[PDB]
Design a protein around this ligand. Structure first.
Ligand code: ZN
Lengths: 967, 99, 105
């Protein structure tokens, strides 16, 4: 019935507004859209377009801005002319040609969409309602921001993230021990600050050699795309804008890059960063009489950015005094004089000692205890002070109250976190296995020849060559000589693997060439599946090899090549490792053993060291095992003794025949070990470590997350969501889904999706084993994206359904009404903790009686069925006059339910916000590091929350009509 | 031109295990239905990747030229031993390893 | 599926044949042999018979299913499912009226 001049809207992109018929041919019709002025031509058949007509009682607006009230409309030759009373002038009998209607006819509360022609589906209405329910419940979940990160659930990490991510403008120095996960806690804190809306602009400054590492870590672990800014990018952004740094929210850059020009550093300091993060800040040397030009640029940055995180190391066994140069940067007024800090650390040293005696299980003389009593400046200290020391029944709880009070009285522990490998439980024990092999005669002959031919060469290089026999047999027996046939180590390796076929074994060698030769020999003489992991490979190929190695029982049994390691997520399923060779320096030895020796392993570690009899290997095994205890224990004595013994030991390497003098070197090594151990145990700040590990509340949080991580409703909602959106989901089978778009996807391009597809896993352990997959949680960008896509659009907001129930009258009306309570506030305030968009379901009858409390949603939805487009279309209009009368029925109950929800939310707000503000005030009353700005921020945030909550409103989001038939 | 390289998109390393670096099965290998007889890559054009996307590709190593595989597979339900291989090159700049 | 009966056969009038046809095929060319997209006016033409691939126009301006009646401004091909390319017939306007061999020989 298309006729030139009619108004039509698109059922889907109504954001275009009204259109106007301006041409018609045999197959097509053309709509002009005055909102933009464009024309769109559609095929007459299947007609996915909607007639826009109005009925008596509607108020409409004309192109001149005035509005009116329609009372009667004539139609002739397909065109409508509206007749009614112009309301702004009170003129009756006013005519408005439909061509002159405005475009600002937006998707009214769906009791208006009944007359839009084809209406949405009923499974998208189901997804719409389920989505609002799940999103509402999950936004208020207590531990938001702590499940989507691709990490192990390590207690101290979760504790640090929980504590720091909730602070305002956090300024902290992370001096965690090397290898514990400093950057992991940093990334978690970043994930919280970005997810909570507290921050939008972030700047991370990293040495260039680590820039790519950061790029991948934030991308693969935290789903965060940073824009790298180099000189080229800086120039192309200088052309596009006055300030180049306004084009991206998240920026990585180098500190050397930051110092290039002065206008560069000022533009950087003016980019209004919310957070700044600088790793390895110990490289910033500062002298009281001469601070470097390097430190000055960070000091300039940290003054223009509220929150600033510094990651660092505390090496060479020195104290936090070396840290003053950086403490001065965190709180320059609180920490402003070195000497006072020196006095503080010296006068606290006895206190630290006395604490170590307390917690070690010793009695503390009154003379000792009346110095801690001097520290805690109170007067009812005595009874609790003595109960802890007499070893009464509650001596444990009195010790715990003492330590708790100590942490609250420590001068720095709130701003400094040092977790040690001694203050953390979970590491597996390590047992050693040594195997003495006969040196084959081919090597004796090959090395004595190198000895003769080795006339003019340093003993250092004599020891570097004789270390690895494989690489001297390639100079005298010719390159590529088949040395893999007589070396007994190879036979031992094969025999052990073929005898332990049901065990995954990690085999470490020095260089990739030897690894390729090992793969070739294991394949061509025993068919052993082994993936190589060397520096020459790309990230995707090595990831592929890790994937193969992760196959439970059908993949590679063995692995591995040169150093590389660095794989954050570890092989927690692997518990047996063999050292095909031994490194030179003890740091490489401890890092190699470190790659597996991590918290979260399956079982204890079995280390197998096959070494040739009477060679440098035989020397080094003796040095490492009896002397340093470096295999079974991890104490970092190696470097000091190695430097103190280097020139002597060289001779013991270049000539393993001379055995005398060795055993005294070994006793010297054990003496050095004992001295270093003693000094380190006597340097432990056990109070700082107790404040660092979070304790029982942190373990409780970690187990609450371990129990929240089995949500199967999440997977069941996900499948529905994607499938409805039109995302093909190929089930590979081994807990991995491959998502690929489809011809029927619902959006031009989906932000995260690509045509090549992405693999996902819902199990945290699989994610920790397969870093090539996306770890899907409630906080994953894919889900949040789809959520915004549905809850912002209007699909799933209106449908009709029939019910066949003999026990009800024909033509009865049940009306599902989904109101949404919302507040309008900037996301920076984080109102969503207290009032996200909240659904309010109501199942009205003809009398306005609610049945939802009696009739659950799922059960009711199951037994319902849809109609066909056409008959249903006017079947809706059959009750157009009825639904209007249905609305006032709910009008009286919506105000009661709303006022109940608002009242409850405002109550929860004032209690929790006053309890937290009181806690922070108590801290200011108990700790000197809490700033005025902090308390002001919380007070203003509480006031703003009560204010924005006092103006919250409701709106009709969804509406489903139900009509019972028996036909 | 299509390529014979062993770098084949979205194939598990199981399938590559039996292929040499040149992309030809090892003489004497036991095969089964569905295994990849030889590796071939179909060229892809007009990728038009964004410059940041190009940088990401560079670090990751993803190849715009590939993304499609024309690799021959063993016919369904036939399984035997590869006894012989022959290579016929019309133009080739130099004789291939296998050649 | 409807419940039908009585399949009827009769002479096709020229106006009915014009009714079935969606477009004129002017040139005998089919495809460019270089880019395998079909000819603008050829035995194989997207604007007459249908889109090659489901719900996406020839030039590639409109590809989503959200659009079901739009006809791309650049390529006059409407975005629908390629199955229609199985039912759309074309027509040729002959300059000289030609005899139907069946009714003659
Ligand atoms: Zn087009």
């Amino acid at each position: 019935p298309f006729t030139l001049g009619q108004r039509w809207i698109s059922d889907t992109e109504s954001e275009l507004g009204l259109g106007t018929v301006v041409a018609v041919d045999a197959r097509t019709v053309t709509l002009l859209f005055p909102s933009t002025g464009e024309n769109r031509l559609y095929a007459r058949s299947d007609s996915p377009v909607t007639r826009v007509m109005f009925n008596p009682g509607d108020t409409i607006t004309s192109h001149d801005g005035w509005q009116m009230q329609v009372e009667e409309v004539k139609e002739e030759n397909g065109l409508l002319t509206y007749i009614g009373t112009r309301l702004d002038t009170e003129e009756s009998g006013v005519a408005l040609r439909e061509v002159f209607l405005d475009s600002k006819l937006v998707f009214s509360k769906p009791q208006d969409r009944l007359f839009a022609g084809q209406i949405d589906r009923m499974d998208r209405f189901a997804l719409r309602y389920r989505a609002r329910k799940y999103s509402s419940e999950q936004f208020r979940m207590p531990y938001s921001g702590l499940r989507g990160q691709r990490t192990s659930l390590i207690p101290h990490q979760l504790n640090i993230a929980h504590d720091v991510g909730r602070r305002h403008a956090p300024r902290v120095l992370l001096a965690d021990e090397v290898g514990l996960g400093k950057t992991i806690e940093a990334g978690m804190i970043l994930h919280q600050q970005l997810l909570s809306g507290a921050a939008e602009r972030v700047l991370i400054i990293v040495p260039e050699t680590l820039q790519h590492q950061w790029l991948v870590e934030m991308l693969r672990r935290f789903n965060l795309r940073f824009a790298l800014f180099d000189d080229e990018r800086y120039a192309e952004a200088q052309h596009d804008a006055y300030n180049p740094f306004d084009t991206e929210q998240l920026v990585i850059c180098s500190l050397d890059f930051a110092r290039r020009s002065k206008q560069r550093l000022e533009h950087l300091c003016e980019a209004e960063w919310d957070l700044l993060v600088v790793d390895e800040a110990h490289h910033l040397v500062w002298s009281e009489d001469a601070p470097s030009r390097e430190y000055q640029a960070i000091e300039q940055l940290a003054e223009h950015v509220p929150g600033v995180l510094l990651l660092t190391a505390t090496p060479e066994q020195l104290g936090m005094e070396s840290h003053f140069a950086r403490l001065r940067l965190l709180d320059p007024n609180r920490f402003h004089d070195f000497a006072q800090f020196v006095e503080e650390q010296k006068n606290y040293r006895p206190v630290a000692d006395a604490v170590a005696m307390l917690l070690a299980g010793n009695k503390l003389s009154n003379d000792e205890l009346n110095m801690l009593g001097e520290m805690i400046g109170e007067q009812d200290i005595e009874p609790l002070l003595q109960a802890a020391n007499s070893d009464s029944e509650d001596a444990q709880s009195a010790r715990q109250e003492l330590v708790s009070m100590l942490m609250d009285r420590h001068g720095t522990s709130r701003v400094l976190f040092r977790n040690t490998r001694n203050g953390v439980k979970g590491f597996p024990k390590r047992e050693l296995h040594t195997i003495k092999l006969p040196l084959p005669t081919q090597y004796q002959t090959a090395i004595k020849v190198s000895g003769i031919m080795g006339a003019r060469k340093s003993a250092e290089d004599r020891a570097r060559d004789m270390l690895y026999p494989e690489r001297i047999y390639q100079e005298f027996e010719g390159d590529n000589a088949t040395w893999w046939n007589f070396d007994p180590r190879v036979e031992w390796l094969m025999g052990y693997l073929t005898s332990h076929r049901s065990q995954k074994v990690l085999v470490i060698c020095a260089k990739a060439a030897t690894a390729l030769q090992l793969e070739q020999v294991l394949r061509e003489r025993e068919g052993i599946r082994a993936a190589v992991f060397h520096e020459g490979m790309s990230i995707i190929e090595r990831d592929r090899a890790a994937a193969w190695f992760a196959e439970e029982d059908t993949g590679a049994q063995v692995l591995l090549c040169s150093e590389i390691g660095s794989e954050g997520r570890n092989f927690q399923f692997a518990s047996h490792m063999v050292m095909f060779d031994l490194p030179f320096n003890p740091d490489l030895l401890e890092q190699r053993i470190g790659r597996l020796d991590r918290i979260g392993q399956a079982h204890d570690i079995q280390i197998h060291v096959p070494y040739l009899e009477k060679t440098a290997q035989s020397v080094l095994v003796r040095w490492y095992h009896e002397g340093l205890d470096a295999f079974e224990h991890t104490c970092p004595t190696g470097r000091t003794i190695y430097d103190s013994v280097y020139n002597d030991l060289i001779n013991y390497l270049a000539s393993p025949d001379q055995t005398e003098g060795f055993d005294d070197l070994i006793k010297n090594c054990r003496e050095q070990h004992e001295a270093l151990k003693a000094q380190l145990e006597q340097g432990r700040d056990r109070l700082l470590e107790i404040h660092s590990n979070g304790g029982e509340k942190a373990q409780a949080l970690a187990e609450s997350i371990e129990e929240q991580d089995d949500d199967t409703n999440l997977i069941a909602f996900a499948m529905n969501l994607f499938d409805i959106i039109g995302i093909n989901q190929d089930d590979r089978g081994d807990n991995m889904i491959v998502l690929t778009p489809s011809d029927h996807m619902l959006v031009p391009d989906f932000p995260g999706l690509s045509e090549d597809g992405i693999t996902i896993t819902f199990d945290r352990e699989v994610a920790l084993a397969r870093e090539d997959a996306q770890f899907i949680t409630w906080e994953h960008p894919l889900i949040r994206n789809g959520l915004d896509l549905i809850l912002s659009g209007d699909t799933g907001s209106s449908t009709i359904s029939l019910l066949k129930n003999k026990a009800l009258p024909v033509g009865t009306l049940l009306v599902e009404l989904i109101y949404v309570v919302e507040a309008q506030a900037p996301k920076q305030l984080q109102l969503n903790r207290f009032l996200p968009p909240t659904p309010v379901r109501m199942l009205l009858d003809k009398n306005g009686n609610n049945l939802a409390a009696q009739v659950e949603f799922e059960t009711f939805n199951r037994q319902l069925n849809a109609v066909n487009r056409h008959t249903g279309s006017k079947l809706v209009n059959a009750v157009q006059q009825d639904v209007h009368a249905i609305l006032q029925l709910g009008e009286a109950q919506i105000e009661k339910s709303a006022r109940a929800l608002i009242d409850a939310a405002r109550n929860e707000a004032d209690e929790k916000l006053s309890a937290e503000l009181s806690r922070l005030e108590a801290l200011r009353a108990v700790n000197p590091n809490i700033r005025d700005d902090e308390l002001t921020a919380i007070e203003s945030n509480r006031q703003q929350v009560m204010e924005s909550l006092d103006q919250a409103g409701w709106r009709l989001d969804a509406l489903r009509l139900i009509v019972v038939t028996h036909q | 031109p299509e390529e014979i390289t062993a770098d084949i998109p979205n194939v598990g390393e199981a399938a590559l295990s039996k292929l040499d670096e040149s992309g030809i099965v090892y003489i004497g290998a036991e095969v089964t239905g569905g295994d990849i007889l030889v590796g071939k890559v179909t060229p892809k054009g007009e990728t038009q990747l964004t410059p940041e996307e190009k940088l990401l590709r560079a670090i990751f190593g993803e190849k715009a030229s590939d993304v499609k595989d024309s690799s021959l597979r063993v016919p369904n339900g036939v399984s035997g031993t590869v006894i012989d291989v022959q290579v016929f090159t019309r133009d080739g700049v130099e004789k291939d390893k296998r050649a | 599926t409807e419940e039908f009966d009585a399949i009827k056969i009769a002479l096709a009038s020229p106006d009915m044949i014009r009714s079935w046809s969606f477009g004129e095929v002017k040139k005998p060319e089919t495809i460019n042999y270089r880019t395998f997209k079909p000819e603008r006016d050829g035995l194989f033409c997207a604007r007459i018979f249908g889109p090659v691939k489901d719900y996406e126009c020839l030039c590639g301006k409109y590809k989503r299913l959200k659009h079901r009646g739009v006809i791309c401004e650049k390529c006059g091909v409407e975005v629908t499912q390629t199955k229609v390319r199985r039912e759309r017939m074309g027509h040729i306007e002959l300059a000289s009226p030609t005899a139907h061999i069946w009714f003659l020989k």
